[PDB]
Structures are given as structure tokens and as C-alpha cells.
């Protein structure tokens, strides 16, 4: 029980394996909706600074075409909740949150362990 202690330990563990020198940002777009003729653009960015840690880098290979892209997973805290389609800015390279994966056994999840795949291809 008592998920508060779990929250404390999770925050401390995340703060342990981290570097306070990598700029990480979070982009939330939302509330689109088409014009009466059927075309418009959603003008909002919603950028918020974020910190965390990364593990398990992997390369991306399509058909031998020499594009040289990479993908990573992340571990994050329980503020500025992660929805299923947000953008994560990691050191000049954007990624899309493909799966959020909250580490959960109850309401108000204590941490997220998302998977980020690089934007474009």
C-alpha cells in the first residue's frame, strides 16, 4: 500500500542516473479542427522543459538505403503527464512518444517509461 513511498523512491531513482547538462524539451500539440472549407493549421506549441534518463539505443534500418537514424527509450517523472502522441526534444533531435507505459498499480502513476521513435523516417 502507501504509494507515496513508491513515489519518493521512484523520484530519487530517476534523479540518480541523470545528467543536468542535456537539454530536454516537451512539445504538446492539440485542439485542431478544420475550416468550413476543409483546411487549416493548429497554431500551438506548448513547450516545457523536461529532465530524465535514456537507455538501450538502437539503429534504424529500412532497405539498405543509408539513412542512419536511431531510436531510444526513456524514464521520466510524474509531472507534465505524457499522452500517446507528444514530441520529445532530445539534444537537437525530435522524437515521437509511441508508447507511454506508465509504471502503474494504482491511480496517479508514479513514473513513465516511454518509447521514443525518431520523427520523419
Amino acid at each position: 500500500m502507501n504509494y507515496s513511498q513508491i513515489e519518493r523512491m521512484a523520484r530519487k531513482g530517476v534523479a540518480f542516473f541523470t545528467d543536468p547538462s542535456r537539454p530536454m524539451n516537451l512539445i504538446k500539440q492539440g485542439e485542431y479542427g478544420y475550416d468550413e472549407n476543409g483546411f487549416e493549421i493548429p497554431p500551438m506549441e506548448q513547450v516545457i522543459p523536461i529532465s530524465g534518463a535514456t537507455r538501450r539505443p538502437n539503429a534504424r534500418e529500412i532497405d539498405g538505403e543509408t539513412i542512419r537514424a536511431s531510436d531510444i527509450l526513456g524514464i521520466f517523472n510524474n509531472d507534465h503527464e505524457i499522452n500517446e502522441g507528444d514530441y520529445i526534444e532530445i539534444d537537437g533531435i525530435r522524437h515521437v512518444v509511441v508508447d507511454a507505459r506508465p509504471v502503474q498499480a494504482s491511480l496517479e502513476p508514479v513514473a513513465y517509461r516511454p518509447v521514443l521513435r525518431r520523427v520523419s523516417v
Binding site: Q29, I41, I67, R68, V96, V98, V119, S120, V121
Partner: protein, 132 residues
Amino acid sequence: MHYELSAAARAAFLSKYRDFPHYMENRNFTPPKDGGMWLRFNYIEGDTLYLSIDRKCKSYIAIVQIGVVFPPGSGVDEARLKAKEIADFFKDGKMLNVGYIFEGAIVHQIVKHESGWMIPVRFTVRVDTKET
């Protein structure tokens, strides 16, 4: 005569779009940092036709494919506009410095992937040769 056709097509394409980010064959290239759109260049060999009985006049067909890739969750209309502009520029009957566009400005189905979407544009170039 197949080297010169590829050279001419590449020359025309990069003369039109030198500045805009693009990838061309067999060179290690990295996508833009901000995730914006970029162009892809491909070259496909067609068949070589023997026209006459004496096998002295031949023809070479090639297919040029240019793809526009755009990030997911950003809509489709701007990509469609860019593809329409490319098709309008690459119209039929244009004369390259070696061969000519047999027929151009075709837009095909969107290929969907969960990391980023792509729209292809395909046309064909031809050279008719007579070896003496």
C-alpha cells in the same frame, strides 16, 4: 547511353532544388534536426529495346521517383501542395540536355507508417539512340 540520362536527370533536379534538403543515392545522409520535410531521389532502370532487324537503333527507358516525407501528426495539405508543385514543374514534353521526359506528373497513393508519412511522385525519361 545510360550514364548521361542519369546525369541529366540529376542535374535538372538539383538545379531546381539545390537548397531544399534532399537525399541522393548511395551517400550517407542524415535527416533534418527539426523533423521537417525533405526530398528523396531514386533511379530505376527500365528495359532496353532493340528496334530494327540489324540491331543498330536502340532505346533506353528510365524511371525517376521523388518522394516527399512529412512527420506524423502534422496534416497532409502542405505535402499535397508541394507534390502538386513538383508535378507541375515536371510536365510532359520537357526537353532535357540528353533525352526527354516520355510522360510525367503522376501522383500515387500515400504509404502510411507510424514514424512518418510519404507521398511518391513518379515520371519517366527516354533516350533514342542510333549507333553508326
